[PDB]
Design a protein around this ligand. Structure first.
Ligand SMILES: NC(=O)c1ccc[n+]([C@@H]2O[C@H](COP(=O)([O-])OP(=O)(O)OC[C@H]3O[C@@H](n4cnc5c(N)ncnc54)[C@H](O)[C@@H]3O)[C@@H](O)[C@H]2O)c1
Ligand SMILES: NC(=O)c1ccc[n+]([C@@H]2O[C@H](COP(=O)([O-])OP(=O)(O)OC[C@H]3O[C@@H](n4cnc5c(N)ncnc54)[C@H](O)[C@@H]3O)[C@@H](O)[C@H]2O)c1
Lengths: 480, 480
């Protein structure tokens, strides 16, 4: 069963001088981890700090999940992991990085059809000022793409707002939602989640953390449904769960969505709902209080392009126009052609189209100068490249699951995305396991504490790497 | 003399039902403008609303400049200008756009050397996750570029934080500064300014508007210096003033900077300090409380790329790392090569280098595969392209000033940037002049009310357009 918090987590919060301070909590958490590393402690200053700590209060489970310091402490550990541990003191060229959580851009990158649209925008000087919500033909293409996946209903361009990635989208949404929001109940964030997203929400409003366990690759929203109140301002939930790779059932999601008041905005993080997800969305996903956020960083492996959008009610998108104009002025006009081509190519794939006639070419404008022969060949090669990428990534995920289970390690079966969650038997600290595995085997893994797994010793393994690196990393994981 | 506010501005605020409401103020301002348009009123609903309004309070000059509704009203007029008037109801393909305020990307675009670095990043798949403050070699190049322009002192890579444009930078800075800022005095924004920047600051803290008049192309900070208090949280000021094109004297800026306490952060908007500006910065610009914000949107004419950075104290940049990671995760990794090449090319130009030896090539890494022959030719052609662009833009600005003065219109002589501020004699409303000029001549101009010129009827004319469009626009301006 999934473990989210236990008595070991409460020990750090109980000995803190100031439990509200996120820096003191991070130092104690790092101090305890480095105390177990007797002769292998990287920073002995924190190890002595934990030794001198003394229990001075009683901490309950409810206190930890309702504290903004818990989100802050995890985010500080998130910061210390990258710039202080993985790419800082312990940075090495001989390390095998299995903790990135992103698809290898050099091996599995953007398709050549989509890279051609970026060179086309460069040649046409398509990098001027544009609308705050995005160019209108780009939004129209996105709406058509999202409509064919719905069981019933369609989407309009007034429901689409292009943004600069999912991290910026949710951060922008939280600031926009909590301007003068009358509802004073704590915002609900479902864990496991992404610390940058949770910390951004904790910036504006107090946050309640609700565990969302998974059983057999199925994400359970039973605990989430009970915690949601009629006065809840917002809810952040992943349809495809990270790091375990579990997936939310459509009927359970539909029942949970329909059981909430219209004043409770539901943010659906759909960045991991791919590579095995049956994307047949119920009409409840188009409810007035539902906001669907997606990004190109994982599915198309372009995190450095900062391209994304969200779907909401047309009245909400109209209000967001004023926020986007002031906050950043508008999205990237350089990638408007890429978004329009991506949305129309994906929509044709869902409809099962194999060849392109004059009807599909007429969807694009005449200013592009598209030809029937060139567009048809481009789309067919795009389909083959996307299907090939899906099969290789599925094979790597399955191969990693079997190889890592052969090393007598408890592994949860993934249902979507590119991540596999595993745990060495007898491990109780996820950050300590990262330090131990990196020192002995030389492979870096993503600790579960960075995924809001306050308890347990499981870690995330990213299987969407080059086969040469992935095989070597798995080989030393079994040997170690 | 410059007029910022008068009795005509106070009339709108006095008749408002709710003076705090920005929408009511915008409707009255638009209603009065459309009341003068007897048979030419675009929306007669607002014209009747102004007629029925009655005076119900007394409004002073100090009340208008200390109200967040004044910033909101101007920003609503900013929104109504673009999506409701220029590109909405009155949108037409026969209109000549002289109100964009940006360099024509199709005619005067990014240099081919800088466009080659974007195609290089595409081929090398340089669109992955990166540091929250930017890639280290990119920041090192920027610091070297900024150091050669200083009269004394140098910059380090710890003082550089890459961001996604100036609008996003100032919006991010305002949120970062006002997290738990103890100083409760009103933030000071110098007008004329950019409504998106002022509205973003008004989001976090109350704002005081301080007029910053110009005389003979010289921006006067005498009024700004008196308004600044030891408890002032932040000050937003443009070194190159928009729309008039005036410039701040270096000695006056140095005296103003050195006369402020270290607790008053000074944001220097330097996006218009080019095309005639003597960029010889005093050491006071490197003070611990000074933040220098720049962008590539105007000087390099790439607003759609969202590329920029700011310079601050190394201690402030370190704290900003946590904010950038949560707010948006980090800057655009796709443009890292462009930033590094831009910064090193500009630094060589300032030093007066004409040829490239092995010493300059060694500054770049060996992973780029740069050759001595190719790099030297690329830099020399980049210098010629940048110098050619400067001369044509200067000629268009000078030609527009003389031709538009020949039409018996009061024109302020510009000292920098690409904008020229003019006023038809007898005009008292800037927005009305925009409606009248667009209806008769067919040329669109940028009203001064959108530049926080609450009084007067002057408008901004953008001279950085194609000569065919600029000449036709000037010809119908004189005829009309
Ligand atoms: N000019 C300003 O200072 C300013 C400021 C704020 C908002 N705006 C917004 O600018 C918009 C201007 O729109 P528009 O009439 O240029 O049309 P548009 O919205 O179709 O295109 C705007 C710009 O997007 C870029 N672009 C990128 N990919 C493109 C593609 N495939 N096809 C066409 N353009 C592409 C080009 O630079 C183009 O000029 C308005 O909606 C306005 O509200 C302008
Ligand atoms: N992987 C993650 O999920 C994640 C999350 C948060 C932060 N980070 C940050 O990612 C960084 C990774 O740095 P790194 O070791 O890859 O080195 P780096 O910082 O030099 O390069 C990072 C990435 O930038 C891109 N890039 C763009 N232009 C480039 C150029 N000219 N040369 C090289 N790369 C270029 C590439 O995708 C490259 O892999 C760390 O600083 C880390 O803190 C990673």
């Amino acid at each position: 069963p999934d473990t989210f918090i236990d008595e070991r987590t409460l020990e750090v919060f109980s000995r803190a001088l100031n439990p509200t301070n996120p820096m003191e909590l991070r130092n104690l958490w790092l101090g305890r981890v480095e105390a177990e590393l007797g002769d292998n402690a990287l920073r002995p200053e924190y190890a002595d700090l934990w030794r001198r700590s003394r229990v001075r209060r009683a901490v309950s489970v409810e206190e930890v999940l309702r504290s903004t310091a818990t989100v802050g402490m995890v985010k500080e550990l998130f910061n210390a992991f990258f710039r202080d541990d993985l790419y800082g003191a312990l940075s090495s060229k001989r390390n095998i990085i299995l903790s990135s959580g992103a698809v290898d851009e050099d091996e599995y990158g953007l398709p050549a059809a989509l890279k051609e649209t970026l060179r086309f925008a460069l040649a046409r000087n398509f990098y001027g000022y544009s609308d705050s919500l995005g160019r209108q033909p780009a939004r129209e293409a996105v709406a058509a793409m999202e409509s064919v996946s719905m069981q019933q209903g369609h989407y309009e361009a007034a429901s689409v707002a292009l943004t600069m990635g999912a991290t910026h989208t949710i951060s922008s949404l939280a600031d926009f939602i909590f301007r003068d929001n009358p509802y004073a109940d704590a915002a609900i964030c479902a864990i496991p989640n992404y610390p940058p997203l949770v910390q951004s929400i904790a910036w504006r409003h107090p946050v309640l953390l609700v565990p969302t366990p998974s059983h057999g690759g199925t994400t359970s929203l039973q605990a989430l449904s009970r915690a949601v109140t009629p006065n809840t301002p917002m809810v952040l939930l992943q349809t495809g769960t990270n790091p375990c790779g579990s997936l939310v059932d459509e009927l359970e999601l539909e029942r949970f969505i329909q059981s909430t008041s219209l004043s409770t905005l539901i943010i659906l993080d759909e960045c991991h709902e791919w590579l095995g997800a049956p994307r047949h969305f119920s009409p409840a996903r188009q409810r007035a209080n539902v906001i669907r956020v997606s990004s190109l960083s994982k599915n198309w492996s372009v995190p450095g392009l900062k391209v994304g959008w969200f779907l909401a009610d047309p009245a909400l998108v109209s209000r967001y126009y004023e926020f986007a104009s002031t906050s950043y002025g508008g999205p990237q006009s350089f990638v408007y052609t890429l978004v329009e081509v991506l949305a129309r190519f994906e929509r044709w794939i869902i409809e099962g189209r194999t060849s392109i006639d004059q009807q599909q070419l007429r969807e694009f404008s005449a200013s592009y100068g598209l030809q029937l022969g060139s567009l048809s060949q481009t789309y067919e090669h795009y389909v083959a490249e996307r299907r090939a990428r899906e099969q290789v990534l599925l094979g790597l995920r399955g191969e990693a699951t079997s190889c890592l289970r052969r090393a007598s390690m408890i592994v949860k079966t993934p249902q979507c995305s590119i991540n596999v969650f595993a745990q060495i038997p007898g491990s109780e600290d996820s950050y300590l396991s990262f330090r131990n595995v990196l020192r002995e085997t030389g492979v870096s893994v993503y600790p579960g504490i960075l995924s809001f797994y306050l308890a347990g010793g499981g870690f995330r393994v990213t299987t969407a790497r080059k086969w040469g690196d992935l095989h070597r990393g798995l080989e030393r994981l079994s040997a170690g």
